[PDB]
Amino acid sequence: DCNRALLTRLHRQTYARLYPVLLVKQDGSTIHIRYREPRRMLTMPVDLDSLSPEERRARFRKR
Amino acid sequence: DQAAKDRLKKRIRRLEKASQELIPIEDFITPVKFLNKERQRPPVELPFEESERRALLLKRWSLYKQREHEMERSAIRSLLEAQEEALQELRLSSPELHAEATKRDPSLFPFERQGPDYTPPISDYQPPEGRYQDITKV
Amino acid sequence: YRSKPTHGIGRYKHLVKAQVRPINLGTDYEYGVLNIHLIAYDMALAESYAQYVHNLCNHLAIKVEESYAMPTKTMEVLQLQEQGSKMFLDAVLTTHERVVQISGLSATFAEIFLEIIHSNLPEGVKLSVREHTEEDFKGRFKARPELEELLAKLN
Amino acid sequence: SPWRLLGALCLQRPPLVTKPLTPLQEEMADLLQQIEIERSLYSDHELRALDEAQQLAKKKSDLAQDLEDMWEQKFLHFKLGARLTEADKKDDRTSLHRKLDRNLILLVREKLGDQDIWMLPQSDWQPGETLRQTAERTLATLSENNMEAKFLGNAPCGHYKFKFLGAKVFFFKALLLTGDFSQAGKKGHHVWVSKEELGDYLKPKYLAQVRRFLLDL
Amino acid sequence: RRAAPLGPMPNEDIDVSDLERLKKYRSFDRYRRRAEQEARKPHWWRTYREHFGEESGPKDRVDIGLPPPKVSRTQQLLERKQALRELRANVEEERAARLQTARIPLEAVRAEWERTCGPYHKQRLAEYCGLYRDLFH
Amino acid sequence: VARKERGWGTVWPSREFWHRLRVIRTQHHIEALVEHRNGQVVVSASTREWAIKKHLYSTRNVVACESVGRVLAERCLEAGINFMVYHPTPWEAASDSIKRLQHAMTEGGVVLREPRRIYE
Ligand SMILES: [Mg+2]
Numbered sequence: 001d002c003n004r005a006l007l008t009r010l011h012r013q014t015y016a017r018l019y020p021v022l023l024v025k026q027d028g029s030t031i032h033i034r035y036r037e038p039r040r041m042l043t044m045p046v047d048l049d050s051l052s053p054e055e056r057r058a059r060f061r062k063r
Numbered sequence: 064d065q066a067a068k069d070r071l072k073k074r075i076r077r078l079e080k081a082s083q084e085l086i087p088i089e090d091f092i093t094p095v096k097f098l099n100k101e102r103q104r105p106p107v108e109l110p111f112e113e114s115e116r117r118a119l120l121l122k123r124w125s126l127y128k129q130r131e132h133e134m135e136r137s138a139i140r141s142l143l144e145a146q147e148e149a150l151q152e153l154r155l156s157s158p159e160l161h162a163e164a165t166k167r168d169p170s171l172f173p174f175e176r177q178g179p180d181y182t183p184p185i186s187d188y189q190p191p192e193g194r195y196q197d198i199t200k201v
Numbered sequence: 202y203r204s205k206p207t208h209g210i211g212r213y214k215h216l217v218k219a220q221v222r223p224i225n226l227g228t229d230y231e232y233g234v235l236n237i238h239l240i241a242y243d244m245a246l247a248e249s250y251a252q253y254v255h256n257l258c259n260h261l262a263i264k265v266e267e268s269y270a271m272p273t274k275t276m277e278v279l280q281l282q283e284q285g286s287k288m289f290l291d292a293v294l295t296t297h298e299r300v301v302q303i304s305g306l307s308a309t310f311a312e313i314f315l316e317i318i319h320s321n322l323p324e325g326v327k328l329s330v331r332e333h334t335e336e337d338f339k340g341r342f343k344a345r346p347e348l349e350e351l352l353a354k355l356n
Numbered sequence: 357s358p359w360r361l362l363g364a365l366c367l368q369r370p371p372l373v374t375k376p377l378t379p380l381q382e383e384m385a386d387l388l389q390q391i392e393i394e395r396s397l398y399s400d401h402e403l404r405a406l407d408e409a410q411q412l413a414k415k416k417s418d419l420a421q422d423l424e425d426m427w428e429q430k431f432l433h434f435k436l437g438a439r440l441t442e443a444d445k446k447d448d449r450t451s452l453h454r455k456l457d458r459n460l461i462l463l464v465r466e467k468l469g470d471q472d473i474w475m476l477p478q479s480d481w482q483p484g485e486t487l488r489q490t491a492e493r494t495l496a497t498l499s500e501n502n503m504e505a506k507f508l509g510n511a512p513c514g515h516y517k518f519k520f521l522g523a524k525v526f527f528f529k530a531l532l533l534t535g536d537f538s539q540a541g542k543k544g545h546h547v548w549v550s551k552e553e554l555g556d557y558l559k560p561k562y563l564a565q566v567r568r569f570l571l572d573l
Numbered sequence: 574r575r576a577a578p579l580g581p582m583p584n585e586d587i588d589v590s591d592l593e594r595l596k597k598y599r600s601f602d603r604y605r606r607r608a609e610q611e612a613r614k615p616h617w618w619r620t621y622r623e624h625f626g627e628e629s630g631p632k633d634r635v636d637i638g639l640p641p642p643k644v645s646r647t648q649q650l651l652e653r654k655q656a657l658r659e660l661r662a663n664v665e666e667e668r669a670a671r672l673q674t675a676r677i678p679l680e681a682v683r684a685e686w687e688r689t690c691g692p693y694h695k696q697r698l699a700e701y702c703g704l705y706r707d708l709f710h
Numbered sequence: 711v712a713r714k715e716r717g718w719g720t721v722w723p724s725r726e727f728w729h730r731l732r733v734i735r736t737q738h739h740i741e742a743l744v745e746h747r748n749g750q751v752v753v754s755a756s757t758r759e760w761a762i763k764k765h766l767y768s769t770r771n772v773v774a775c776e777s778v779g780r781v782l783a784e785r786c787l788e789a790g791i792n793f794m795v796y797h798p799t800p801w802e803a804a805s806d807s808i809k810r811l812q813h814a815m816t817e818g819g820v821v822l823r824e825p826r827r828i829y830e
Pocket residue numbers: 646650
């Protein structure tokens with residue numbers, strides 16, 4: 001039942017050419033996204049770490 | 064002194080009586096750069112085989128959509144009939160129970176849910192580091 | 202005419218009108234003005250699922266208040282380059298939010314309705330259902346720097 | 357008429373992975389992509405590629421492809437997650453991570469003194485309690501696990517009676533948000549099951565029409 | 574002074590309260606259909622039909638004619654249904670309907686009209702032209 | 711030299727005619743009428759008729775409107791009525807089916823927009 005509203009187009013008059021780019025969040029999941037600049041893969045990066053995770057990120061960057 | 068507070072309260076009243084006009088929506092407005100990228104876009108002569116395949120596929124899609132809407136409406140009707148005979152059964156069971164169960168709970172107020180994705184989340188995966196800078200115009 | 206039995210045969214203004222709190226009563230709990238937010242990075246999925254939600258409301262006879270759109274939130278993807286402590290530009294990620302403003306339902310039809318919504322969520326759509334507060338109404342409106350300047354001069 | 361008091365719960369697992377397209381939706385997706393290309397007003401990547409092409413043609417008469425190769429290479433280097441966590445194990449109906457496409461429901465197995473039941477999880481409440489909190493304490497107690505599950509609301513959904521004296525049963529419906537099941541190899545037989553092999557497994561007349569208010573999807 | 578109406582008001586059936594729940598027509602064509610349906614009913618007030626020559630209104634028409642042909646309704650319906658299914662079975666019918674290029678044999682249409690409903694149509698032309706009025710009243 | 715019913719104007723359509731073409735486009739069938747000012751129907755061509763119904767395909771089409779127009783034009787020539795007034799709605803005037811139905815009426819030989827009254 002997740003396939004109901006997926007089958008659609010852009011209904012506007014003037015619009016650029018879009019591409020089915022696969023995006024990943026801070027996890028293993030992928031989502032199909034109409035996005036320009038026809039790269040096949042797009043990734044989202046880790047932000048700000050945490051108070052006890054900034055030191056772990058610094059240690060991972062050092063190692 | 065007090066005259067400063069008088070002209071101040073005059074200012075809050077005067078800029079309060081102005082309009083609360085909305086932000087424009089970017090998506091409803093065609094951008095300016097989209098004008099001159101049309102001269103090298105030629106029309107495509109659509110062949111008859113492609114046109115008839117598109118048309119018959121549209122007829123099959125319309126029939127399938129009508130049938131799928133019909134079974135979704137049948138499912139919601141079955142759920143509603145079950146819930147009708149259900150509330151009748153509980154009302155015949157106990158008065159205090161339908162006094163309690165006709166509520167919408169305050170825990171429903173932050174109802175948030177995320178749609179399913181293409182691939183499942185994998186374990187032991189480390190995406191790289193980065194930052195986000197908000198360029199949304201205010 | 203007044204004295205005739207055919208008086209008021211031309212009466213029409215009582216049939217067409219042309220000139221919000223939740224009502225919590227204890228037995229019939231009709232709850233008022235809610236916003237259903239549909240958040241996606243893709244134009245087609247956001248607009249089509251807003252269309253599907255609005256058409257489902259029209260079929261299920263909810264008096265819909267509005268069907269509107271939030272302004273776009275443009276996130277920027279700056280990533281850390283390999284072998285360096287450098288930032289490079291990767292993606293311009295636009296976030297679009299299509300919101301359906303519904304007036305009133307019941308609790309029963311809230312289980313039915315939200316069950317159909319998260320059964321029918323497409324790929325890459327974040328669902329949110331909340332009430333109508335002051336902040337959700339102020340979200341479509343621009344900043345008020347002159348009013349914050351006046352309030353800061355007050356304080 | 358004496359009444360015997362039983363709640364019950366319907367613990368719905370949401371799908372994680374979208375289902376594959378039927379062939380009619382696949383060919384409609386092809387049509388929709390074709391008409392998006394037909395109505396598309398080019399792109400900044402294709403404009404640059406055409407401009408570089410015509411300037412190199414004019415220079416030889418008198419890069420976008422590198423980016424294409426790099427993007428395809430970084431796509432081919434990346435391996436995606438496995439869509440099929442079902443067929444690689446092919447035996448376990450017990451695990452929470454069993455099926456990703458369909459909706460899943462929980463059953464547990466108990467042997468009674470006078471009955472042998474294959475049962476959706478149920479309850480028992482003293483009359484001072486409310487059935488919503490009864491379902492919450494049942495979920496917190498009987499499965500000995502940390503299931504952060506969002507209940508839908510106060511209104512019940514499943515409603516069946518069997519009379520000996522009568523005995524009365526009220527199924528609720530509640531959706532899982534996040535889960536943590538301790539002691540995965542416990543002796544209590546719990547199964548996460550979908551609608552078709554649910555219909556295969558469930559014998560009773562009272563539990564035969566749980567599919568009436570379970571969504572088919 | 575107020576008097577009592579002799580019969581029902583036209584718009585008293587629908588509820589004044591809760592206007593949002595009542596379904597609306599949004600089509601002027603739907604209003605045209607509804608108004609032309611409403612104008613043909615015998616209202617109790619003074620009407621155009623009463624004053625402008627409806628030719629006695631309801632008239633008990635004495636029929637001096639041949640019996641209608643007795644045709645089996647179920648057999649007629651099933652043969653019409655089977656002919657329709659064999660007509661929609663073709664693909665070239667779909668092609669001719671879509672591409673706006675299809676013709677009908679008007680001579681065969683005229684023949685089947687003369688067999689089927691031509692009697693009733695000629696009866697209403699004779700009624701309109703007053704053939705019955707000046708011959709058989 | 712007969713009396714037309716001049717007047718009205720606040721209502722629509724104008725009732726100043728001897729014969730009027732009435733096209734009812736139902737979601738299934740297409741039904742055209744030639745109506746006198748009395749309200750009686752003179753000649754009608756509908757796709758509810760079995761005589762047309764076994765001859766056309768897909769009762770709703772523009773081609774169905776063409777069949778209706780040609781059949782009613784032939785029936786009007788058979789009934790001796792050659793003039794009528796057609797008053798379409800401005801969104802029905804731009805439609806494909808009504809325009810080519812008027813084309814079929816013109817090619818059929820029925821001239822729309824009735825002649826002016828003598829000493830009106
Ligand atoms: Mg019959």
